Amino acid sequence: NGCFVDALNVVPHVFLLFITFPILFIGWGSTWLHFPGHNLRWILTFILLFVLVCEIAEGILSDHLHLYMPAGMAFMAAITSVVYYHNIETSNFPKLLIALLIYWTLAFITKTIKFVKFYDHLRFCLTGLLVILYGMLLLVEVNVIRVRRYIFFKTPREVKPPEDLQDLGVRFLQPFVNLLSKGTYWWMNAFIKTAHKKPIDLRAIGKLPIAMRALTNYQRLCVAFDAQARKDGARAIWRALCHAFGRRLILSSTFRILADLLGFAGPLCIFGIVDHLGKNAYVLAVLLFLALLLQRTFLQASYYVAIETGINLRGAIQTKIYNKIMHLSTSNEMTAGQICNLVAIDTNQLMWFFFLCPNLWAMPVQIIVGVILLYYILGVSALIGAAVIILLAPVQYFVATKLSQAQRSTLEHSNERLKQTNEMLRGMKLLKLYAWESIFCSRVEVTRRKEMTSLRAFAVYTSISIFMNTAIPIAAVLITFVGHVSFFKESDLSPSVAFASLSLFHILVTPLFLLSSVVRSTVKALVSVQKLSEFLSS
Amino acid sequence: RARFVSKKGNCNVAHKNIREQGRFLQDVFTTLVDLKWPHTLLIFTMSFLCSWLLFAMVWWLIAFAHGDLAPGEGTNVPCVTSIHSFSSAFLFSIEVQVTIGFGGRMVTEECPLAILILIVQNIVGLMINAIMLGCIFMKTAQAHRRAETLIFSKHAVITLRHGRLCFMLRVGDLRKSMIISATIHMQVVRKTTSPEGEVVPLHQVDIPMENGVGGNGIFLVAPLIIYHVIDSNSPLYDLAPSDLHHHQDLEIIVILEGVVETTGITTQARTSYLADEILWGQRFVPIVAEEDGRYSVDYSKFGNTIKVPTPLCTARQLDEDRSLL
Amino acid sequence: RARFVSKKGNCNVAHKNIREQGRFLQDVFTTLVDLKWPHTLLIFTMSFLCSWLLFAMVWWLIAFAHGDLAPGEGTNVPCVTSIHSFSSAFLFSIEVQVTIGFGGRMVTEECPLAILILIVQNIVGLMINAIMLGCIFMKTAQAHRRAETLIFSKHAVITLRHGRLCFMLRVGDLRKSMIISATIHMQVVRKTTSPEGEVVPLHQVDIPMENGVGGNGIFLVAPLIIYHVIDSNSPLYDLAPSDLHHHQDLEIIVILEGVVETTGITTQARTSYLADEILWGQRFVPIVAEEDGRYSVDYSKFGNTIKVPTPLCTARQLDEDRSLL
Amino acid sequence: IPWRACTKYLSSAGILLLSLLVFSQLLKHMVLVAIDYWLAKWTD
Amino acid sequence: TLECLSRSTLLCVSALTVISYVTPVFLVALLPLAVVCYFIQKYFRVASRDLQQLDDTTQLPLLSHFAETVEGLTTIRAFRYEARFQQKLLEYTDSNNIASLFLTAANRWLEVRMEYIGACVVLIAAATSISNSLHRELSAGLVGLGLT
Ligand SMILES: Nc1ncnc2c1ncn2[C@@H]1O[C@H](COP(=O)(O)OP(=O)(O)OP(O)(O)=S)[C@@H](O)[C@H]1O
């Protein structure tokens, strides 16, 4: 009785989709309350979305409408559960939670019946995954009622929704939104639309949440510094910052590595599609769509979390070195300039290095996965190509260094020019009272030629950089495809192999440039933190 | 600066830190039935179609489960005679729900489960029909489109009448329908500091509406300038004419209450006048005019104003000068 | 000790020895329709099922009695064609009662008794349907969930304003919906003995609400401390500050009346303040604050209170000292 | 910012190098697409 | 920056022309989405510029403030005014962080939305290529360029 069980599975989705529409149309026709397991619930809902896409793929492979309708119904059921939890987070109720719990229980029962009738005789894995996800969502609901006052005794002892991000006017609400918008930044639609019309200002801007201020970051940093100094330096301050900023940085880094994995994964499904048609492809196309969107979303969340940790760190160490500015002694002009450079360039170096910290962990795994993947697609010849592209990364660094050197020289000349200008633009009446102005303009032009001379070499290095940027992608394919025959087998190169190699070449060229800047930023940040330690401990 | 209640009549003060513990009940329906006629029609057809499809699905399911949906001759009688596919099942659902009863497909006395599904279908249909009728009738009692059309002049003036300073402000009707026993509650707010060191952020005080021997109410047929005279006892008696235009923060609100004729409900109109809105030493233009055989009211001159050579001085100093003259 | 009316607004005085002779009538329905929505739905489905089963039983009985229930071919026509058992009888009952009319089982023109049972079934069904629709619509006019949300501060204070002793007590709104023409009836009760030897167990007397030139009503947008000043004419003017805390029995009740906007009904809120509840010589904390561009009201400081260095003495002795100073 | 600032900036360079830049860029991108276009026919 | 802008714009035009030539039908589907980007452009710049300048402003009095504390350090430690000045510096660093934070939030917004559209276009391109270039078109060499 397969169709019988299929209809039995179709029923509960219809039940929920019909109960939701009156309440959804009431809600469609400013305090955010969050419940335990909200992030877990949204994660599980996205996993449900993925498994339902897989079930739709199965139903397409099989075809019999009644044999694949359950997936299309559970799709709208999960979307409506999302709308329900949005309507509950915007306005809490003890009854809508029960209305969701009933549906969860019924769906679990139907899936259990399906599993039993299958065991008595690809479907197996998808059914099991759905069972597990529905069970975990049921446990989340049970936790919610155990914490809430749904069926518990008289009063719930509610949380008094947090005034940290919902009290008197605040505009930057990142920590206090739906975990989908925490990823897709949907809360910025209102801000940007209002910004189009009315010019933004500090009165039109928000105020920072209690989660990120000078006081909060200073408190965490001084607690870590205290716990480290009570056990007694450069390494000390370093480990203090590390233990103080903790979980956020590693969270960003792991977001980043998972995104890197999926990005290395995309071209392989491209390859599979190209193979299939030349000799099971719509599924690969929709999977490619899903993997692209998810990879890029995770990449962006990673960027943002890293940037926010860096901004926290900048505020913290800035207010800390200002606290140190109060207790210093008068015996220690040059120190003032060194202090204000310690805030204008050293702190910016520290913070930008903290931006690039997760990239330094995610780059090696990216290049390793890239080389191992391209080897299994092109064979020994791939290795040769895998060398050439990699060889651009150290060379780039060298080029960069030359630039820096040139920059220094140029800056010197520039400064002198400014001096020879500051006189002319002050003795204006004196200058023009006897028309000695051309005589000084000759000297000013004499300085300018030297400045121009420096700029030639700088722009030559810039040209070499831009040239290598697009030359190495061409050279890789050249010396790889022409050398594929030369290296060994010289077997027919199907379009899939060549185009997958092309995709991987671009996906590997993009990260390679960043490693050079990362190395420079890291060494400069190390020097700047040594400087900060020498200052902060005088 | 900040206003107390807006010109349109809505309130401006935003409430903060409400307990909000009691507002956790199901007042679902009435709020949906208050909505706009298009939105309300949309949600009504939505509810009806939702119930219809739900019970059509359950009937198709039960006909499939009994085996009566499997086309077979003999050895059975379908719980619902002449049922073939989901289309005929939905047709049976709409035939039994909205109580048309075509009777081409007949529910039989063989299956009590169909009897139960019918006995719950009919009662839920009757209950949803009853609520969706009561709510639309309660909606058709909406006369809010005709209410709140009352108008006041944008800025109010002060003049010198009967040797005393006076407040002049226009009100008026906009439809044929009258308003019964309309009363005026004229109030003034200000941040006040008591002599005991107590500072209040806002202080409402009643300024009287000067009518005959008594009375808090008026009679509205034509635009009637409300006539009050500030005296030494009035709270507004202490201000100055040159400090009101820019710096001071004084909101004079009027609350005109009254019951409309046709509906009998008691509506009201609240409006504010700021310190920068009110002006000094002027006179309104006479609206009413002796027409052919009636009185013609021209609303173009409603907010028009003419200069009057009246002395400009503070009400306290004006009362002192009256004691001197 | 005993209170007059409780804080929640309900009355405390229990009535004894009511004649109770007139309350012997059938007001059955309205009281059932006032009940909670779950209980009311329960009793509605109960009434419907009761009537349905009653008439199904009588129809099965009449089909059994005519002999048409005895399965036989020829020599008769069943009063209701195609009737076999009690199940089909109940199906016919629900088919004719709720007016679906399947017509698989047909009542015939052979038996006038079936005609009579149908002609009474339909009219009783229509009457019960009409009452069960009118009552649920009368129920959906329940806006009592939104009413009675008005709040007063738990204890009221007295202070010294404008050189005279004054009563300060906070009121306020809890929703966006306003209340039209809210009036205050402030009263005080006490066991009083007249100079003629008459002792009354409780004596209500009006203590005025001090507003502008006149007026018994107020205007509620923000929490507005009601401001009364006890003078030598006021009934409360004779008490002492040290005897109120423990021994004396004085209940000061306020009755705030007003008509809500959306429904138009006139609701009210009554609250009491005992002798042990009220305290002396304090000041409330200013609630309203000049926010970004509006007025922010903080309800956390609603019942908060600060000490004020004010003299502590009886109102009679305070008036004597004012005569001396 | 209008096209006039960039127009003056590039006209300070002269007609000698403007086209030498623009057409060379166009031709480089045309080559970069044509190599893959020919690889497409290379495959099968 | 001029070189980078030129390379970027020409690479984008070339890629659009490639995915158009590969599939005739896919072209007609991509012009809608691109018009979407136009609306995403305006609303971005008129804010991205604004926030930008705000950042600059919150950077200028902060640093200057630092310098003022360093020179007149003896006067400030003498007046015992350290608390109020620390309050001022917390205020200034908050005003800097809110700006430098909204700027990165807006950049993330534009990034994510443009990327979602860039994934919609490859979805539609592959969905048209699998059918048109295989079932009827019967061409293998096309889908490669378009997908890549
Ligand atoms: N115990 C009671 N409870 C309720 N109502 C009462 C009661 N006693 C009297 N009433 C009614 O209220 C009115 C009060 O009048 P009474 O005090 O009873 O004087 P009366 O001369 O006894 O009048 P009666 O009892 O009608 S002959 C009467 O008209 C009664 O109808």
Ligand SMILES: Nc1ncnc2c1ncn2[C@@H]1O[C@H](COP(=O)(O)OP(=O)(O)OP(O)(O)=S)[C@@H](O)[C@H]1O
């Ligand atoms: N923040 C608030 N928002 C809305 N209503 C409130 C709030 N605080 C108190 N109330 C209610 O209004 C009345 C005001 O009394 P309060 O100022 O709270 O003095 P109280 O001694 O704290 O009384 P409680 O809170 O009930 S123990 C109370 O009876 C509450 O029921």
